[PDB]
Design a protein around this ligand. Sequence first.
Ligand SMILES: Nc1ncnc2c1ncn2[C@@H]1O[C@H](COP(=O)(O)OP(=O)(O)O)[C@@H](O)[C@H]1O
Ligand code: NA
Lengths: 293, 10
Amino acid sequence: ELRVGNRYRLGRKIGSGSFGDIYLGTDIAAGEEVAIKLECVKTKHPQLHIESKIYKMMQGGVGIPTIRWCGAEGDYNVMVMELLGPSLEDLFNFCSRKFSLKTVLLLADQMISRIEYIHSKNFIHRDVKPDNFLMGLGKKGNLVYIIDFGLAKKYRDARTHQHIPYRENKNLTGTARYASINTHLGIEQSRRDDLESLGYVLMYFNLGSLPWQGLKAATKRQKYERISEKKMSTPIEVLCKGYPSEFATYLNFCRSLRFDDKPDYSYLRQLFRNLFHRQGFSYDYVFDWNMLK
Amino acid sequence: SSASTVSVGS
Ligand SMILES: Nc1ncnc2c1ncn2[C@@H]1O[C@H](COP(=O)(O)OP(=O)(O)O)[C@@H](O)[C@H]1O
Ligand code: NA
């Protein structure tokens, strides 16, 4: 129950990421619940101000949380943001780790759009995973948001749109379960890698798990390499067996993209939209979790 | 498991 800025009241922790913690808050002046990220000012490597800059750069985008205030109060750097709802991982667990094809396709449509939006602002996300997509609350309850720009980086110059150079010999950045094959090989991430990751997320929602989950290793680095080997040895047609061909076509498309290629986001959305229509589904935003009694 | 689901890097 601390005052933050002029008009924000801090409540209980709702989340922790790589740095700081996320608290329920109230905007006392507006009568609105918010999320408040705190980062201890005495950290050697401050990151919250950089994250707030990236969120500010993303403002106006559908499914980008609004940043309401940034500052520093007592022991903390402070970022106040729109309060969002549960993650897609949370909702997956709530739905007994089964999504209907309709729900997967409703999500795919928005998630491709969110990634395209981030790319349009000269960034790649590099941490595409079900934990980093949150449904909105209230009037925004049908909207998928993307969060966690802790690994986000410019893939091109904001002036010239000059693409970052090709590099190899990288250590893995991001989440091993959903990382692109290029990422596992130590190649620089680009737009294609966020989309390939989304393709693994979509097949994750379809299957309940990916075939490279639960691989035993002595060390993290060895585990990344076992996941790498399993991904590279699992044909897309085997990963996607018993599911609509569109999931395989999507992953084949992303795996074919050149390092500096602009993805055809419209093609990828239309792939799922055509499937959605062939199934006779409506874009009515009735997700599986909306049916929980 | 944390090793496969925890993001790494900065
Ligand atoms: N605006 C928000 N509303 C609700 N919960 C949030 C919000 N932002 C983050 N969280 C929760 O806190 C966790 C940590 O967030 P973090 O990875 O630091 O993301 P960000 O920096 O974008 O807030 C998230 O995994 C999520 O569970
Ligand atoms: Na809904």
